[PDB]
Amino acid sequence: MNLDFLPNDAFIEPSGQNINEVASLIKKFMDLVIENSASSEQRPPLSQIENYTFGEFPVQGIPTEGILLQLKEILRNSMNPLTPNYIGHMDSIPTLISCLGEFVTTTLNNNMLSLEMSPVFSQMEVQVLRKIARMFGYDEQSGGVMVSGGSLANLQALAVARNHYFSVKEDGLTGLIEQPVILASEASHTSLHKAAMLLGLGTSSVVAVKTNQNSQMDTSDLEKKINKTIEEGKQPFAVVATAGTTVTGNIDPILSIAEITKKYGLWLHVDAAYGGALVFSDKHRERLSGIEKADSITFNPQKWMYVAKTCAMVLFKNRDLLETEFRISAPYMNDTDFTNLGEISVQGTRHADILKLYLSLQHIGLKSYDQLINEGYLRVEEFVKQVKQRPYLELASEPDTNICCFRGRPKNLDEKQCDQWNLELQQFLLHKERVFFSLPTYRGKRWLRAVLLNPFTPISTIQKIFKTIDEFYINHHSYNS
Template identity: 50%
Template sequence: MDRLKLPSSAFIDPHGNNRAEIDALAQEVLDLVLSHATDALSRSPLPEKADLPAMVAIPEMPAPKERLMESLRMIVAGSMNAAHPGYIGHMDTMPTTMSVLADFVASTLNNNMLSVEMSPIFSRMEPLLLKEIAELFGLGTHAGGVLLGGGSLANLQALAVARNLAFDAHGKGVAVLERQPVLFASEAAHTSIQKAAMLLGLGTSAVIPIAMTADAKMDTDDLERAIRQAKREGQAPFCVVATAGTTVVGSIDPLSDIHDIAKAHGLWFHVDAVFGGALALSTTQCGRLKGIEHADSLSFNPQKWLYVSKTCAMALFRDVRHLQDSFRIQAPYMRDPDDMLNLGEISIQGTRYPDVLKLWLSFQHIGRQGYAHLIDEAYRLTERFVQEIDARPFLELAIRPELNVLCFRGTPQWVPSEGWDAWNEALQVSLLKENDTFFSIPRFRGRRWLRAILLNPYFGEDTIVKIFEHIDAFQAASRNAAGSPDAITKHSR
């Protein structure tokens, strides 16, 4: 093939003829990325809106390397600074070193998880590793699953299998059904559950919301009531979705009780453990997941609390054979391997990146005890954070945290209650601009709350001290501006 019109470094020459040029280019990019990562504290956790490079448009002719590097520097500088210990507003953090290096290896190899012949070693690694992870959750000897590009896809795959098994919908679908299929999830469940229902042809109204208790868990009495009501109204319940780590406050639904109700009604029991599933690696914290061992399926994202670079998520099944019996679409252009299925035939995704490499390498490099230590440390720091909140009469928690998710707000007595949302929004802006700490500010039960997720391995007590010194200064300035007396009483809740 004639390559004369291409840059000499457009591809890595398999004959090695451009090795020196590729080495130099790779080193320049590596230096840029490592300089950014190792100097993360010199920049804000969340940069100002950046102008996109002028060369975003597809050029007619190749851009020179100098222009490429200039644009790449702008892109890196304008990106979310996940390595900064002050970036605590979302369930995103810095990746493990091995997952970064694995991405380089996997992209260079460019294998395709669609089939064994396209990824001969990765296609065999993935089922073995996921079977072991399923055993951590106690799912049994027939458990296993597939990796997917995010928790939303993992929930979609799990609910697709549940639907197909309940209604024999693999071939005939659900349009022929006389009764409307419905499933049940907490009103705090992730929006991907509704998206899954929409994509599965059920409609978002098929997800019946279950009320939360005062501590933001699924109300099992309301679940029982809703199932009975759905049956009376001629609907066809088929699944209950519990959550192990809700997005806003990190609550864990009562998994054992929910399983008992689902089993009593013959319903599939799915657990969205996208975030909280990491507790399975900690012997001191795994008891918080009691009941997850009864799940028919669960979703889990190592890209969150296991620090694997995005994307890396999985759908696990108590009986992985359901993927073959109730989901598989055989690809006629693929040769059947002798000892296993082509993963693309039993997954929502066909062509897929080999995420298993970065997950496996991260486990090898850090080990189960290393991950357990990270999880336990997050709990220690969470308790320290809670102590600071409790010590301040003008702050309140949404719930007592079950995970490393803290949701709190200011309720200053010198500000009318209708102004508390604006006060907390101003505090969030101040913390970012003046203290290099990013909190998200979600809405929960009709109010704005500051939310922190303590994930970053370099987050420590010194950061907590600085955060609350700034909060104290902010509230003092606010009180002085309002001309309020010094005496502040705890807000009555």
């Protein structure tokens, strides 16, 4: 009786008889997490060792002790992006309030499928997304939806555009004569190809446009590509403008692209998954000029807003387009004026991600977020200043965000020797000061990429890193030759 087979703390009994055991277990977990996270800076950003002993469920439930030991062992070997010496990827330190809100949401166990399941979260999400859309420059007719990652947002926007221009919602793409074409920058994200493939358009449907030296779209090249594809059998219907590309973090000229698309009557989609956070900065918001011309926007607050994963949204200039092109009246649930979020979304059941974003915005505030963005820009400006004044160092392009991609180009060394030199420098930096630099391959060459997101990285760290770089250059065998 009273569930004697289950462990005394398997569930939180609604009556509340086992409150003491639940409290003790929660306290143990909280203490372990606090101890692990407090000493993040001491541990190296990356660990080479990995664990591979899983996939054997026990017949008898293991006690809380032992489980805690295994959890601690797993945690020690996990990736460590919380240390200040991790400036290689877009992952950064998340706000504490967001993590606590995520825990609260998991404990509540509500659902975003319908309003009945989320009486308050649905309205909160609607209002918060409306405020964000207003901040991007849209009117009251604009409307958005939250998804799990920017890939789903891109897929939803492309599907809506395809349905609106071709009206294949109920028939399909088999009867169409000319293949639709989507034009994208040659430095665009890899999710565009997957989205095009999943919609039946074809992986080869995406047509790449040339970019200038700063990894920005070339408007004349875009016009030439549009004309060349029109003369052929295919017909263009969408143009994708990327703000904050993946590698160099550059921003396309959205204003000219929007003008061209309006001239040719194409659907303009803006992918500001990283650059969107600029709308929270008074000084640097103008870098996104013309974003109000796009027919849809993809935004990821989890990147530059320090919100625990995952938080991502897609915004549309017109709500009726989402209500008609995407929505299907097949479901016959209870009639309610409020539109269920599962009908106009790619996925039906979704975890309530609005709470963490709302809590983060309330706790930090607008001014603090503006200050954080300004500090990141200051760090990137100092990094760029240090990169110059060194003949052997060259920049891929002038930065537009807190991302800087640079490389070493010894005069005597050739391309392969330069790549080996860059890889050796990355390894040396990682092993000496525990500073992590990503090593992407752009334009056929390896570049050391640094994303400056950690608020605790000081200028002295950058100066010490560059001093170590100079020491490595002087001590390397190439200089002797």
